[PDB]
């Protein structure tokens with residue numbers, strides 16, 4: 001997270017750290033008792049490596065009573081996702097068992113109505129991604145409040161030049177932004193999950209290249225199919 005601040009410990013009980021061989025790789029969001037939603041590019045080239053999900057965490061390294069590392073039974077990338085595209089960039093992770101719920105571990109209600117979030121809506125994005133241009137990794141969860149950017153501005157030649165489909169959404173990136181390692185994390189608007197940070201490498205903190213987030217409402221039927 002660039003231009004953000006340390007999040008209040010355990011105030012986002014849905015927050016997941018998707019890890020490969022014990023290292024934070026991507027953000028994630030607990031969407032059901034046994035299911036964590038993330039971005040599909042996260043799992044690319046992971047084939048062999050041990051994928052796990054850390055729930056109830058604030059610090060990645062320190063012991064916390066609510067902190068629990070879960071093994072993964074199944075990794076389900078969207079069938080239409082592709083290495084060289086930003087489309088259908090969603091990944092569903094089935095934990096080895098249903099998560100132990102409590103004040104620091106709870107699924108987040110997610111948007112099923114396929115209508116756009118209003119431009120200007122202040123949304124929350126959290127993560128353990130880099131915090132500066134040098135690549136400094138924070139030990140504890142960071143967050144930033146970002147206003148949603150209308151699709152037409154986001155689609156200008158100066159910005160993302162027509163790459164923003166109706167299944168994608170944008171947020172402003174003026175100094176405050178998601179960055180490397182925030183990929184797959186949640187964009188929460190009015191206490192409801194609206195987007196998943198895309199996992200395509202993108203410049204961070206540049207106003208002319210807004211944040212791109214996959215709209216969960218656009219994939220409601222796919223998320224339901226997988227969980228079933």
Ligand SMILES: NC(=O)c1cc2c(NC(=O)[C@@]34C[C@@H]5C[C@@H](C[C@@](N)(C5)C3)C4)cccc2[nH]1
Nearest residue numbers: 041042178179180181183198199200201202
């Ligand atoms: N979303 C953003 O804001 C944003 C992402 C990003 C980035 N790249 C990643 O974060 C990942 C995401 C997953 C897991 C890891 C390998 C990878 N190929 C797939 C790329 C790291 C690099 C530089 C700036 C960036 N900015």
